[PDB]
UniProtKB/Swiss-Prot annotation:
Pfam families in alphabetical order: RrnaAD
Family statement drawn from the similarity comment of this UniProt entry: Belongs to the class I-like SAM-binding methyltransferase superfamily. rRNA adenine N(6)-methyltransferase family. RsmA subfamily.
Keywords, comma-separated and alphabetical: Cytoplasm, Methyltransferase, RNA-binding, rRNA processing, S-adenosyl-L-methionine, Transferase
NCBIfam families: ksgA (TIGR00755)
Function: Specifically dimethylates two adjacent adenosines (A1518 and A1519) in the loop of a conserved hairpin near the 3'-end of 16S rRNA in the 30S particle. May play a critical role in biogenesis of 30S subunits.
Name of the protein described by the UniProt record: Ribosomal RNA small subunit methyltransferase A
Keyword Transcription regulation applies: no
Membrane-spanning ranges: none
GO-annotated cellular components: cytosol
Statement: the UniProt record of this protein carries the keyword Cell division: no
Natural source organism: Coxiella burnetii (strain RSA 493 / Nine Mile phase I)
Binding-site list for S-adenosyl-L-methionine: H2, L4, G29, E50, D75, N95
């Protein structure tokens, strides 16, 4: 676990989020509450989600007199964010390890109607992948799903020296904002997830070969997609189009 301790970074995070007392926030991976201590004065309610028993015990001692802090000892990967009963979508924030980043994001996406926006500290590489340009070596399954669900923005890089103990690599803050008002929509989100997972299973296949069990040769022209391209060359809407012809 890497705990953020640099006050400049911490304040920079608060500024990016711009918490308001209208807001209900959920912080995943609060650590010692370094960021929490800034946030609790700026919002209506702040729920902390953490699986570690010792961390939670420390947090409970720290915040049991704090009216607007609520603490959940739960697995964030299984957490039902709709169980935080409030009138408005939640603002999610947090500090995530690499190994849990994709599954936590996908989990949040599956409940995205519950979520106003997200600000996370992640390993810089993950942020690059989330915000990757079509065609790049960083553009893959994570890129495609995250960019289908959200408009995503790299905000700034954070050096290892900001954390205790320090990570081995650069970190970064990313903003993800659920999209609305776009067309075409994927009519079936499971179909979309399957198409994209299959497409990127073997990155060096042509998409035609990758998806040969799903799309036959006569269908590629209907999608106006060149099946000789590798999947990394397809746009998010290309994948949405693939998904929709299957439903």
């Amino acid at each position: 676990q890497h705990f953020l301790h640099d006050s400049f970074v911490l304040q920079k995070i608060v500024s990016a989020i711009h918490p308001q007392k209208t807001d209900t926030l959920v912080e995943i991976g609060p650590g010692r509450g370094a960021l929490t201590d800034y946030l609790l004065t700026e919002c209506d309610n702040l729920a902390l989600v953490e699986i570690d028993r010792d961390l939670v015990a420390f947090l409970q001692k720290k915040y049991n007199q704090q009216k607007n802090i609520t603490i959940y000892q739960n697995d964030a990967l299984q957490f039902d964010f709709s169980s935080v009963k409030t009138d408005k979508p939640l603002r999610v924030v947090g500090n995530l390890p690499y190994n849990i980043s994709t599954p936590l994001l996908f989990h949040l996406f599956s409940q995205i109607h519950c979520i106003e926006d997200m600000h996370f500290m992640l390993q810089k590489e993950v942020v690059r992948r989330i915000t990757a340009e079509v065609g790049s070596h960083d553009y893959g399954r994570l890129s495609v799903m995250a960019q289908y669900f959200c408009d995503n923005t790299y905000l700034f890089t954070v050096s290892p020296q900001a954390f205790t103990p320090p990570p081995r690599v650069e970190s970064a803050i990313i903003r993800l904002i659920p999209r609305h008002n776009f067309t075409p929509v994927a009519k079936n989100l499971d179909q979309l997830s399957h198409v994209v997972k299959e497409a990127f299973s073997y990155r060096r296949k042509t998409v035609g070969n990758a998806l040969k069990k799903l799309i036959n040769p006569s269908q590629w022209p209907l999608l106006e997609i060149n099946p000789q391209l590798r999947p990394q060359e397809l746009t998010v809407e290309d994948f949405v189009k693939i998904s929709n012809i299957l439903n």
